Amino acid sequence: DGVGSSSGNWHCDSTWLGDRVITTSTRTWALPTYNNHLYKQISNGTSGGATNDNTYFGYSTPWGYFDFNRFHCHFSPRDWQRLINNNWGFRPKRLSFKLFNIQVKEVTQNEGTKTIANNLTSTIQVFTDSEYQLPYVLGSAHQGCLPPFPADVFMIPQYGYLTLNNGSQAVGRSSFYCLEYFPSQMLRTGNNFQFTYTFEDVPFHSSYAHSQSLDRLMNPLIDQYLYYLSRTQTTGGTANTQTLGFSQGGPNTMANQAKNWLPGPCYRQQRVSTTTGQNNNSNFAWTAGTKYHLNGRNSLANPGIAMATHKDDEERFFPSNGILIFGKQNAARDNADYSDVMLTSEEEIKTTNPVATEEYGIVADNLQQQNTAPQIGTVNSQGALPGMVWQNRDVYLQGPIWAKIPHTDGNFHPSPLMGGFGLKHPPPQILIKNTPVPADPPTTFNQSKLNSFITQYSTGQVSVEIEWELQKENSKRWNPEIQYTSNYYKSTSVDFAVNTEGVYSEPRPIGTRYLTRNL
Amino acid sequence: AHSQSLDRLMNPLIDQYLYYLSRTQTTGGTANTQTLGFSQGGPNTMANQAKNWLPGPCYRQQRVSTTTGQNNNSNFAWTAGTKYHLNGRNSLANPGIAMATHKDDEERFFPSNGILIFGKQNAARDNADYSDVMLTSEEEIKTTNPVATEEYGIVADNLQQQNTAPQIGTVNSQGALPGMVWQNRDVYLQGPIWAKIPHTDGNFHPSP
Amino acid sequence: AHSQSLDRLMNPLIDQYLYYLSRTQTTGGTANTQTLGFSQGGPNTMANQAKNWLPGPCYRQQRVSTTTGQNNNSNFAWTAGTKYHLNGRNSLANPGIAMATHKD
Amino acid sequence: DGVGSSSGNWHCDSTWLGDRVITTSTRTWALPTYNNHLYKQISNGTSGGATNDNTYFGYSTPWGYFDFNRFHCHFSPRDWQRLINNNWGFRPKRLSFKLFNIQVKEVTQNEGTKTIANNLTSTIQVFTDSEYQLPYVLGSAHQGCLPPFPADVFMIPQYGYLTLNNGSQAVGRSSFYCLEYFPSQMLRTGNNFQFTYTFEDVPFHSSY
Amino acid sequence: DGVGSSSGNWHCDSTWLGDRVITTSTRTWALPTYNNHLYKQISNGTSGGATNDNTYFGYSTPWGYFDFNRFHCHFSPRDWQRLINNNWGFRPKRLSFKLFNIQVKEVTQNEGTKTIANNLTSTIQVFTDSEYQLPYVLGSAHQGCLPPFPADVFMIPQYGYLTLNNGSQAVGRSSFYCLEYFPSQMLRTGNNFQFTYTFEDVPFHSSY
């Protein structure tokens, strides 16, 4: 474990083995000293501009954390292509994490001339929250994951957390955590860190689309033996009176046929169009937004339960807060243009799932009588009903992978809404920090905590290995399937590649669901 | 068939130790003002008693009668039909989730698309008579399951205040709620036996 | 008791990479027309942030106060009661599914 | 024992086991050079303001000392809560002490521009007064213990002692101690120090 | 594998053995950081001066490469003389490659005064494209091979490649490669790299 010997090698590869694929990626990182070595209380209240919906109480910390919860941390674009085009499903089995080649540096600033040198005897600290005792902040779709492009160098994100609040104030149950109250490894240059984790059994993600729909599973050529009420009134001439008539469902009355199953749950959302002209002229984004209400605070149900983005022939429409949206490269943080963002679509599930912007269905409102005409009600939110079947949201190359399932007495179908695999025991948080190095202390004792420190940062490499288990296709379909393909014709630059300026970009979102399977 | 019903699992002879709000206003004379009064559930107030369970799910259907005279004079079979909407297409939810066909003493009523119907021999394919078909009934489940043609229940609509009287809402479709218990639809000698459960990520209680 | 709430499991210091529709109409002056604007969820817009989970089930009940003066003057205990209907009989859903008694 | 390898890891935890609790804490420290490398005689007399009640004779030394004689050096607030709420008594049984990850630095001052660099070949010296031959200065409630908050960084206190005095003057029995007349470990970066101690039987404190 | 110990020795020799000759050469090299750490798309089109015959689409990379594909990398002039004057044919059988004595340096520029120092904890990365997955750029007669004269010191060439183009534009089949998507060895000063390769059967060159 020398100053002069490397502690790691660079592993970035993929290997495919029948029913497994293993991915490895290595990236270079930089870690600053965060927060001036301090833990600070932060809050947001209702004074000034701030709304109640946005209040919080929390702490910010001197630590940083490692995040690889984005598919493109692990899969190259071509690899993602091999996966989606060929497999019905996949899931994660196990991972390996390595930190190595660690360099701690001190920066000296005199007279506007700045210099950087190694501090050989310096350490950094790392630990994993193996027991899940710290608030789990992965899974909230934050920035700071390993870059898609291997050549890119990245900065480690600062760690902070939230607890209960009333306005800008803490409450009795509010909790404070010190990360220094955990055991951590200390590494000098020449030391390394590693750990291994095994994923819990989780269902394969469905990289497939149904080639059948719930409302059409019958034999087109045959009648049912079952009957339905087809006529309530006589049909001939003007003297029409009530009657009862019954008919057998058949090829031309598939809508009426008796069926075994129901479409999935519905929490309806407002429809907006990409053709702006077709939209109402108000700013209705949050006012007409679909929301949930918790303890007096309102949150967008974004993106909410999975529903199809649009019905047949209406690519223009999307749910206002019902899809995942990714930025194009260098898209602005605020108020980016439609041309600067990429909207996902979940067409593939119209097959079993309600369209996002429409009713679930219709129910009776009242009791009909000779003097009372029957009335119906439109159902815009439907909870789980026996016989319902549904599909989860898709995952994307630039999307999230896993989430920690919250620790609660109950849940229904705990698949993370943003997409991915939901785990009771997800990959643990990995926290890293530069150890403080004091500048020279005073020569006579003072009890106050030291506030003068040498200025330091560290850089190193990090490796992640994941084994994924694959589910192969078993289709008897005669004709060819849809596949993700690169564009045939000439172009100014190559998709999923660099610029003349050296900027990698991902042009489109890529989903998982090209192959088909029956219902 | 159950010989007990969800709303009557108590001991008829004993009071609960639990209390419920029984009075919101004073009772004597004309100068009546708000108050709070609390009482213990008992033999004569079984409706008020605290209970552990809830009836099963409800997707309400229109009621029709075998006595034609009692029915509205329109052809309302599909217009007033209970339906689901999938990708722009509408289908009868026939017969839908299991609910009891009728309540006590009302054999005449059935849900318009909520029961299985079999033909008598040589009944016509189209527009057969009532006398030519046989309607099933699922009386046996009124015990735990909502009647097909009625509301699940009532919920509050608003927030009452000194100046605002309280308002209630009628619930005609109810999804699964914790504490719900229910019974499946019956099977018949001339009925189906099995179905393939569709291959999907999720399902709730995949009984055909 | 939980020391965290469902609506606040994020990192207070970091933005989401996900975007949401933040603007439906232009903001400047009087000639305001429709547009589409998108923003990233963040520390000051926690209400808007994309989230994984939903709160538990709800069967709503009427609110009454211990300060009698603040209550409507009717006897509304069973008339405004939350109920279930079984075979033509009505029962209080007492106490019903678990919901919090009151807010902050 | 390299320049480039850490000699310790950060342990800060509590574990509760029935009738034992074990606490671990780690803190970062800084030690200045005290006294310019000198031992100095100090006294306080009766001249000027000074009263007789406050007289002393003593020495100050180039050394520093480690103090963890404050409960919150070891117990987090929540831990203290588990202890007091649940137990009739407690007492200390044994301890482990470690010094590690040592960096010695030299500071260079020219022209108002100051720079700090490592001095790799430098040493520090540590020893324990296992035989109780030096005046025991813990136990007098001084400042300079490890901080309650683990994230805080602290400065080591200077060591000094007192002996017999008459006014500002020494007497026959007054004693002078040199700490360099004890054996001590010398550590460069990459070296570490540790020791183990067992508490004598002592009565449980009454948390009741 | 120390900071202070050499990891290699200088071997430059020839030995002749009847039907074999073995050559060894060692050279000193320097590697700059290329491209500012970036991969950049490059093209040449038909605008301006440029003819169609000279169009290309490609990328340039942060990497450098080692080239010894020139006979005088291995044979001294006198050695070449012994070979040509005396033999009807020759061919290559196997090779050994070593990288050693690696020094990584950082350069600091302030106020027009520049200084160079070692960065001890720094690494370089090396790999061989053993599976031929990158575009093979040797064999195109480029500059940057090891010098003929052993005393000369040389600069490592930058690596870049080309793919399909239409004019200055990419086409569907155009490919992008990232070299960081390969496993590589990381070496600090005091680490070394080596590999061995065997030539496939190939016909003797005719020196006649």
Cβ density class D120-155: b for 16+ within 10 Å, e for less: eeeebebeeeeeeebeeeeeeeeebbbbeebbbbbb
The DSSP secondary structure of chain E, one letter per residue, reads --SSS-S-----EEEEETTEEEEE---EEE----GGG--EEEEE-SSTT--GGG-EEEEEEEEE--B--SGGGT--HHHHHHHHHH-SEE---EEEEEE-S---EEEEEETTEEEEEE-TT--EEE---TT--S---TTS--S-BPPSSTT-EEEPPEEEEEE--BTTBB-TT-----GGGS-BEEE-TT--EEEEEEPPP-PPEE--
Q: Which of B85, B87, B113 sits opposite A213 (nearest CB)?
A: B87
Task: Cite the beta strand spans of D2-134 per DSSP E.
Answer: 13-17, 20-24, 28-30, 40-44, 56-64, 89-90, 94-99, 105-110, 113-118, 124-126
Q: b/e per residue, A191-207, with b = 16+ CB within 10 A?
A: bbbebebebeebebbbb
Rounded to whole angstroms, the Cα distance separating C25 from C13 reads 29
- The b-or-e profile of C26-56 (16+ CB within 10 A means b, else e) is eeeeeeeebbbbbbbbbbebbbbbbbbbbeb
In angstroms, what separates the C-alpha of D107 from chain A's closest C-alpha? 7
Q: Which residues in chain B have their CB less than 8 angstroms from residue C64's CB?
A: 21, 24, 36, 160
Structural determination approach: X-ray
From A75, A96, A107, select the one nearest A192 (Cα to Cα). A96
Cβ-based contacts of C79 with chain B (< 8 Å): 166
Which candidate, A454, A458, A431, A451, places its Cα nearest to that of A177?
Answer: A431
DSSP C27-86: -SSS---EEEEEEE--GGGGGGS--S-------------SSGGGS-SS--TTTS--EEEE
Contacts of A487 in chain E (CB under 8 A): 172
Contact A173, C1 (CB under 8 A): yes
Query: Which of C65, C86, C90, C101 is the best residue to mutate to test the B interface, defined by the most B CB atoms within 10 Å of its own CB?
Result: C86
Query: Positive or negative, the Cα torsion across C19, C21, C23, C25?
Result: positive
* D169 phi/psi in degrees, rounded to 5: -115, 155
**Strand residue runs (E) in A67-208:** 87-110, 113-118, 124-128, 153-155, 158-163, 185-187, 193-198, 205-206
Identify the helix (H) or strand (E) that includes residue A29: strand A20-31
Integer Cα distance of B104 and B101 in angstroms: 10
Burial of D104 (0-12, 13-18, 19+ CB in 10 A): middle
Residue in C61, C79, C84 nearest the CB of B55: C84
Of D6, D70, D76, D124, which to mutate for an interface test with A (greatest number of A Cβ within 10 Å)? D6
Contact between chains at C100 and A295 (C-beta distance less than 8 A): yes
Of D10, D13, D155, the CB nearest to A186: D10
Question: Pairing state of beta strands A153-155 and A20-31?
Answer: parallel
Tell if the CB–CB gap between A500 and E2 is shorter than 8 Å. Answer: no
Paired tokens of D72? 């919150």
Beta-bridge partners for D122: none
Nearest Cα to A439, choosing from A112, A37, A158? A37
Q: Which of E126, E62, E186 lies closest to A149, judged by CA?
A: E62
Q: CA of C57, closest CA in chain A: separation in Å?
A: 9
Chains touching D (3+ CB pairs < 8 Å): A
User: What residues of chain A lie within 8 A of the CB of C18, using their CB?
Assistant: 141, 302, 324-326, 418
Cis ω for the linkage preceding B95 (within 30 of 0): yes
Listing DSSP states for A349-371 in one string gives GTTTS-BTTS--EEEE-S---SS
Element (H, E) at D83: helix D77-86
Cα–Cα distance between B58 and B174 in angstroms, integer?
5
Closest partner residue to C85 (CB to CB) among B36, B153, B156 is: B153
DSSP letter string over A53-96?
Answer: GG-EEEEEEEEEEEB--SGGGT--HHHHHHHHHHEEEEEEEEEE
| Chain B residue with Cα closest to A373 | B72
Q: Is B142:B135 a contact under the CB 8 Å cutoff? A: no
Nearest chain C residue (CA) to B172: C85
How close does chain A come to E48, measured CA to CA in Å?
A: 18
A402-407 long-range contacts (CB < 8 A, ≥24 apart) are A402/A69, A402/A92, A402/A138, A402/A139, A402/A426, A402/A427, A403/A138, A403/A139, A403/C52, A404/A132, A404/A136, A404/A138, A404/A139, A406/C6, A406/C9, A406/C53
Q: Is B22 helix (H, G, I), strand (E, B) or coil?
A: strand
CA dist A502 and C82 (Å) reads 65
Q: Are the beta carbons of D198 and D93 closer than 8 angstroms? A: yes
Choose the closest CB to C14 out of A44, A142, A327: A142
Q: In E63-95, which positions are buried (b, 16+ CB within 10 angstroms) versus exposed (e)? A: bbbbbeebeeebbbeebeeebeeeeeeeeeeee
Domain range spanning residue A516?
1-519
Distance from CA of C103 to the nearest CA of B (A): 14
Question: Nearest CA of chain A to the CA of D120: how many Å?
Answer: 8
Relative to beta strand A361-364, strand A376-379 is antiparallel
**Tokens 């009565």 label which residue?**
D203
Q: Is A422 annotated as a binding residue?
A: yes
Q: Which residue has the tokens 């599976």?
A: E131
CA-CA distance, D71 to D79, in Å (whole number)? Answer: 11
In A207-310, which residue ranges form alpha helices assigned H by DSSP?
A: none
Residues of B in contact with A223 (CB under 8 A): 125
In this complex, whether A and E touch, counting 3 or more CB pairs under 8 angstroms, is yes
Are the beta carbons of A243 and B68 separated by less than 8 Å?
Answer: yes
Closest CA relative to residue C22, chosen from C4, C43, C3, C47: C47
Measured in angstroms, the CA of B137 and the nearest CA of chain C are apart by 15
The count of structural domains within chain A is 1
Give dist(CA E109, CA E118) in Å, integer. 14
Q: How far apart are CA D167 and CA D51, in angstroms?
A: 10
Shortest CB distance from B82 goes to which of A260, A363, A410?
A363
**Contact assignment for B205 to A372 by CB distance below 8 Å:** no
Residues 6+ apart with CB under 8 A from A248: A223, A224, A225, A226, A227, A228, B125, B126
Backbone angles phi and psi of B7, in degrees to 5: -85, 0
From chain E, the residues in CB contact with A4 under 8 A are 1-3, 120, 188-191
Contact A145, A67 (CB under 8 A): yes
- Contacting subunits of B (3+ beta carbon pairs below 8 A): A, C
Task: Check CB contact under 8 Å for E178 and A120.
Answer: no
Q: Kindly report the number of other CB atoms within 10 A of residue E54's CB atom.
A: 10
CATH number at residue A517: 2.170.30.10
C-alpha–C-alpha distance, residues A326 and A310, integer Å? 19
Chains D and C touch (3+ CB pairs under 8 A): no
Identify the DSSP state of B185.
P
Contact list, E43 vs chain A (CB under 8 Å): 500
Length reported for chain B: 208
Alpha-carbon distances of D171 from A115, B102, D43, D55, D164, rounded to whole Å: 57, 111, 12, 13, 6
Residues of B in contact with A359 (CB under 8 A): 85
Q: Which of C10, C50, C56 sits opposite A162 (nearest CB)?
A: C10
Contact A311 B208 (CB under 8 A): no
Residue D53: strand, helix, or coil:
helix
Resolution in A: 2.7
A422 Rama class: left (phi>0) / alpha (psi -120 to 50) / beta: beta
What stretch of H or E contains D81? helix D77-86
How does strand A516-517 pair with strand A209-210? parallel
Query: Which residues are within 8 A (CB) of E51 and not within 5 positions of it... i.e. 6 or more apart?
Result: none
Q: How far apart are CA B74 and CA B67, in angstroms?
A: 15
- Termini Cα distance of chain E: 49
Residue that has been written with the tokens 């000063």 in this structure: E189
* Residue D70 C-alpha, separation from nearest chain A C-alpha, in angstroms: 14
Query: What letter would DSSP give residue D97?
Result: E
Pairing of strands D205-206, A516-517: unpaired
Secondary structure of residue A44 in the 3-state scheme = strand
Which residue's entry shows tokens 């995952």? A395
What DSSP string describes B76-134? -TTTS--EEEETTEEEE--S-S--BS--TT-TTEEETTSS-EEEPTT--SSSB-GGGEE
Contact D103, A121 (CB under 8 A): yes
Q: Using CA atoms, how far apart are residues D65 and D61, in angstroms rounded to an integer? A: 11
The rounded distance, in Å, linking the Cα atoms of A225 and B117 is 9
Beta carbons of C24 and A284 less than 8 Å apart: yes
* Distance of residue A7 Cα from the nearest chain E Cα, in angstroms: 8
The shortest C-alpha distance from C83 to chain A (Å) reads 18
Query: Any idea what DSSP says for residue D80?
Result: H
Of D6, D11, D113, the CB nearest to A183: D11
Are A261 and B178 an interchain contact pair (Cβ–Cβ within 8 Å)?
no
Peptide linkage before E203 cis (omega within 30 of 0): no
**Do the chains contact at B166 and C83, CB–CB below 8 Å?**
no
What whole-number distance in Å separates Cα of residue A181 and Cα of residue A303? 37
Q: Is B5 annotated as a binding residue?
A: no
Whole-angstrom distance, CA of residue B42 vs CA of residue B49: 7
Work out the widest C-alpha separation in chain A, in whole angstroms. Answer: 112
Reduce the DSSP state of residue C24 to 3 states and report it: strand
